[PDB]
Enzyme design. Structure first.
Site, PDB file in Angstrom:
ATOM      1  N   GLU A 268       1.123  -1.281   0.200  1.00 40.51           N
ATOM      2  CA  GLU A 268      -0.198  -0.050  -0.314  1.00 40.51           C
ATOM      3  C   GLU A 268       0.691   1.080   0.375  1.00 40.51           C
ATOM      4  OE1 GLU A 268       0.394  -2.385   2.357  1.00 40.51           O
ATOM      5  OE2 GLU A 268       0.371  -0.718   4.726  1.00 40.51           O
ATOM      6  N   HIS A 292      -7.862  -3.731  -0.733  1.00 39.45           N
ATOM      7  CA  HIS A 292      -6.984  -3.698   0.149  1.00 39.45           C
ATOM      8  C   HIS A 292      -6.021  -2.681   0.076  1.00 39.45           C
ATOM      9  CE1 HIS A 292      -5.752  -6.164   3.994  1.00 39.45           C
ATOM     10  NE2 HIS A 292      -4.189  -5.635   2.870  1.00 39.45           N
ATOM     11  N   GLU A 293      -5.846  -2.655  -0.918  1.00 33.28           N
ATOM     12  CA  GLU A 293      -4.485  -2.252  -0.847  1.00 33.28           C
ATOM     13  C   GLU A 293      -5.008  -0.583  -1.273  1.00 33.28           C
ATOM     14  OE1 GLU A 293      -1.531  -2.784  -0.312  1.00 33.28           O
ATOM     15  OE2 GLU A 293      -2.021  -4.573  -0.863  1.00 33.28           O
ATOM     16  N   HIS A 296      -6.267   0.233   2.546  1.00 30.88           N
ATOM     17  CA  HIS A 296      -4.693   1.077   3.027  1.00 30.88           C
ATOM     18  C   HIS A 296      -4.889   2.316   3.402  1.00 30.88           C
ATOM     19  CE1 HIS A 296      -2.591  -2.751   5.471  1.00 30.88           C
ATOM     20  NE2 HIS A 296      -2.327  -3.377   4.311  1.00 30.88           N
ATOM     21  N   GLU A 315      -3.997  -4.728   9.235  1.00 28.04           N
ATOM     22  CA  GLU A 315      -4.446  -5.747   8.665  1.00 28.04           C
ATOM     23  C   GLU A 315      -6.068  -5.787   8.881  1.00 28.04           C
ATOM     24  OE1 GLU A 315      -2.827  -6.011   5.903  1.00 28.04           O
ATOM     25  OE2 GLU A 315      -1.043  -4.872   6.509  1.00 28.04           O
ATOM     26  N   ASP A 372       9.621 -11.094   8.859  1.00 25.23           N
ATOM     27  CA  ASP A 372       9.846 -11.864   7.882  1.00 25.23           C
ATOM     28  C   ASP A 372       8.856 -13.105   7.596  1.00 25.23           C
ATOM     29  OD1 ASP A 372       9.510  -9.481   6.382  1.00 25.23           O
ATOM     30  OD2 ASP A 372      11.277 -10.087   6.187  1.00 25.23           O
ATOM     31  N   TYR A 380      -4.585 -10.826  10.143  1.00 26.59           N
ATOM     32  CA  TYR A 380      -5.523 -10.611   8.416  1.00 26.59           C
ATOM     33  C   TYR A 380      -6.816 -11.077   9.193  1.00 26.59           C
ATOM     34  CZ  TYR A 380      -2.139  -9.056   5.359  1.00 26.59           C
ATOM     35  OH  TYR A 380      -0.641  -8.861   5.014  1.00 26.59           O
ATOM     36  N   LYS A 562       3.125 -16.364  -1.338  1.00 29.55           N
ATOM     37  CA  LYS A 562       1.965 -16.926  -0.659  1.00 29.55           C
ATOM     38  C   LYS A 562       1.350 -18.097  -1.653  1.00 29.55           C
ATOM     39  CE  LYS A 562      -3.074 -15.709  -0.772  1.00 29.55           C
ATOM     40  NZ  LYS A 562      -4.261 -15.507  -1.577  1.00 29.55           N
TER      41      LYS A 562
HETATM   42  O1  LIG Z   1       5.332  -8.740  12.284  1.00 30.08           O
HETATM   43  C1  LIG Z   1       5.209  -8.732  10.878  1.00 30.08           C
HETATM   44  C2  LIG Z   1       3.873  -9.799  12.081  1.00 30.08           C
HETATM   45  C3  LIG Z   1       3.491  -8.341  13.423  1.00 30.08           C
HETATM   46  C4  LIG Z   1       2.643  -9.402  14.206  1.00 30.08           C
HETATM   47  N1  LIG Z   1       1.972 -10.286  13.669  1.00 30.08           N
HETATM   48  C5  LIG Z   1       2.220 -11.038  12.453  1.00 30.08           C
HETATM   49  C6  LIG Z   1       3.628 -10.914  12.084  1.00 30.08           C
HETATM   50  C7  LIG Z   1       5.190  -8.597   9.749  1.00 30.08           C
HETATM   51  C8  LIG Z   1       4.361  -7.264   9.173  1.00 30.08           C
HETATM   52  C9  LIG Z   1       4.807  -6.747   8.041  1.00 30.08           C
HETATM   53  C10 LIG Z   1       5.541  -8.247   7.457  1.00 30.08           C
HETATM   54  F1  LIG Z   1       5.944  -7.229   5.759  1.00 30.08           F
HETATM   55  C11 LIG Z   1       6.042  -8.758   7.175  1.00 30.08           C
HETATM   56  C12 LIG Z   1       5.873  -8.608   9.265  1.00 30.08           C
HETATM   57 ZN   LIG Z   2      -2.666  -4.766   4.404  1.00 21.96          ZN
END
Ligand SMILES: O=C(c1ccncc1)c1ccc(F)cc1
Ligand SMILES: [Zn+2]
Ligand SMILES: [Yb+3]
Ligand SMILES: [Yb+3]
Length: 607
Positions: A268, A292-293, A296, A315, A372, A380, A562
């Site tokens: 986004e 969705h985008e 945001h 999210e 990551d 989500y 994904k």
């Molecule tokens: O670290 C997170 C995360 C935060 C809370 N719950 C799950 C993942 C995250 C947020 C953004 C992203 F691009 C990659 C990971």
């Molecule tokens: Zn999103």
């Protein structure tokens, strides 16, 4: 406290503005230049500060026209290396200075993917794109790399003159480069304060076509026509989002369709949403990613998570708005179909991680976790499920959308935590507190596994998918003859996808069933990436060797995590394809997106 960041916290100093002057060097795969940070002290007698960096080469730091002392600390794995700068004069509270840092990125920057001409559509020019979320901005430039700090920015970007630079900002003109006539300088201005994870840059042979009063689509020439059609509902979605969220404040809403290795469905970035070419189904069926985008632009970019522990605020709310946009366009039964689907994706995530796993918690403690690695559908869909449960508890969509609009207004331009959200929820619904107190907050927010309550879902559109899935699962060999292409007659692409998702939840199926499914439905012919993904996963988990090359091909011809991650994991779990899977990963690894490469490597347990 932002445990993902090594910089001075917002309570010590805060960046107000970044001016970036840089040049993109494709021959060395480096971005070289200066980041001038306007920094405001929040403390009396401030004499130093710390910035985040990661694989950056620092040439010098200049304040008041003189070079100052700085020191880089030891690398802290994925967090990078802290940079401490010794200020030449102590600062009083609220005093602002400009700090100019001369720097160069590494070819291995985790924020960037550098593509050769052969990895592009046109085959003549190279291409560069960034992806900063969550904590990769430090891999591009020194900054306070935390979403608890919001800044404006301006940028001047020098690129080979045959190429185009774009950023998450309003385009502010172009000129030949005075230092080098083979080059062009593109300029940009972002006048709305943003967290630094929203800084984005692309450089390549890009063309644009207008598709709405405030939207151009950008891509290489060979994708322009297809993208313009695919995303033609964009303005009508924006108009709906504005009705739900309040005024769109960002000026432009442009779309950039990236090369296939872009790691997410969308990102986004303000003024310029980035999307995967895997959305180009030909029939606008994957446009919920655009909804969705778009959403945001309010939830995430205006109201922002203060640390990554609170990612579900970003999210969950965005999915909640996304599904309203889709319900307005296509009807309330369709919002419920998508909601119920998301619950199925949540079931899948919890099952994958395990029901007691800490990453299945809504609020997660990221202290020594790479964001990551923790990334999944949980924020989500568990976040969506909470808001949908609350909607139902509190009197319906109309009432809950009143709260969402007030929430966005209340926290616009701020960064907030789960407790801030909960506090305002209770304030807004003062007359329904006894209802709010019926919620198991501790379980919803802090406990692993599935939520303690499942919301109510209209089933109208889901019934036919479930029915057909169950026919297949309970079928014996002597039943396979009764299946026929007319089974699919009255199913939309969304329903075909859901039928497969339902059937995938019970995989494997016997191999003869899967072979029959191909015989009668010809799922091998479908190029919708969502459908094709689930079908190939069903084929591989049900041990159909014929599907191995199809699955290997999809895994490597695009890189949306994904799809690429579960496909490689499935190919690795199947004994017949295990060796090819690791070999294929080893061959493609150097030319993959750095984050995708890292995660697929960990999934495959290779290296
Ligand atoms: O670290 C997170 C995360 C935060 C809370 N719950 C799950 C993942 C995250 C947020 C953004 C992203 F691009 C990659 C990971
Ligand atoms: Zn999103
Ligand atoms: Yb201008
Ligand atoms: Yb039978």
């Amino acid at each position: 406290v932002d445990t993902c960041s090594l910089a001075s916290p917002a309570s010590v100093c805060r960046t107000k503005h970044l001016h970036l002057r840089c040049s993109v060097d494709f021959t060395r795969r480096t971005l070289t230049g200066t980041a001038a940070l306007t920094v405001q002290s929040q403390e009396d007698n401030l004499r130093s500060l710390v910035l985040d960096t990661k694989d950056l080469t620092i040439e010098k730091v200049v304040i008041n026209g003189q070079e100052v002392k700085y020191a880089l600390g030891e690398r802290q794995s994925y967090k990078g290396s802290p940079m401490e700068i010794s200020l030449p004069i102590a600062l009083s509270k609220n005093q602002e200075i400009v700090i100019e840092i001369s720097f160069e990125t590494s070819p291995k920057s985790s924020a960037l993917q550098w593509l050769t001409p052969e990895q592009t559509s046109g085959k003549e020019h190279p291409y560069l794109f960034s992806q900063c979320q969550a904590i990769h901005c430090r891999a591009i430039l020194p900054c306070q790399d935390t979403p608890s700090v919001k800044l404006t920015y301006t940028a001047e970007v020098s690129v080979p003159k045959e190429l185009v630079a774009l950023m998450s900002a309003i385009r502010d003109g172009e000129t030949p480069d005075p230092e080098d006539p083979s080059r062009k300088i593109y300029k940009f201005i972002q006048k709305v304060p943003i967290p630094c994870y929203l800084i984005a840059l692309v450089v390549g042979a890009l063309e644009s076509r207008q598709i709405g009063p405030r939207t151009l689509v950008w891509s290489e020439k060979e994708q322009v026509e297809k993208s313009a059609y695919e995303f033609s509902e964009t303005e009508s979605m924006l108009k709906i989002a504005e009705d739900l969220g309040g005024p769109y404040v960002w000026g432009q809403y442009d779309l950039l369709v990236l090369p296939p290795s872009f790691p997410y469905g969308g990102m986004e970035n303000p003024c310029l949403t980035f999307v995967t070419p895997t959305l180009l189904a030909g029939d606008k069926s994957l446009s919920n990613v655009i909804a969705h985008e778009i959403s945001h632009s309010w939830t995430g970019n205006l109201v922002t998570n203060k640390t990554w522990d609170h990612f579900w605020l970003n999210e969950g709310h965005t999915v909640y708005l996304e599904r309203h946009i889709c319900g307005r366009l296509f009807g309330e039964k369709f919002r419920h179909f998508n909601a119920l689907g998301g619950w199925g994706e949540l079931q899948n995530s919890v099952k994958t991680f395990g029901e007691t796993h800490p990453f299945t918690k809504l609020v997660v403690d990221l202290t020594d976790i790479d964001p990551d690695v923790a990334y999944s559908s949980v924020p989500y869909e568990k976040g969506f499920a909470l808001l949908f449960y609350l909607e139902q508890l509190l009197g319906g969509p109309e009432i809950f959308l009143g709260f969402l609009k007030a929430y966005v207004e209340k926290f616009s331009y701020k960064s907030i935590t789960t407790d801030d959200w909960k506090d305002f929820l209770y304030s807004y619904f003062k007359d329904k507190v006894d209802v709010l107190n019926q919620v198991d907050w501790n379980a919803w927010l802090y406990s692993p596994g599935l939520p303690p309550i499942k919301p109510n879902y209209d089933m109208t559109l889901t019934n036919a998918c479930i029915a057909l899935s169950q026919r297949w699962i309970t079928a014996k060999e002597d039943d396979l003859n009764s299946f026929n292409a007319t089974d699919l007659k009255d199913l939309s692409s969304h329903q075909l996808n859901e039928f497969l998702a339902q059937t995938l939840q019970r995989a494997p199926l016997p191999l003869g069933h899967i072979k029959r499914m191909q015989e009668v439905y010809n799922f091998n012919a479908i190029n919708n990436s969502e459908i094709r993904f689930r079908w190939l996963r069903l084929c591989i988990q049900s041990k159909w060797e014929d599907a191995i090359p199809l699955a290997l091909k999809m895994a490597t011809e695009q890189g949306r995590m994904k799809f690429t991650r579960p496909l490689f994991k499935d190919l690795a779990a199947f004994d017949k394809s295990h060796d090819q899977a690791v070999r294929t990963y080893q061959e493609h690894k150097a030319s993959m997106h750095p984050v995708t490469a890292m995660l697929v490597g960990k999934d495959l347990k290779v290296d």
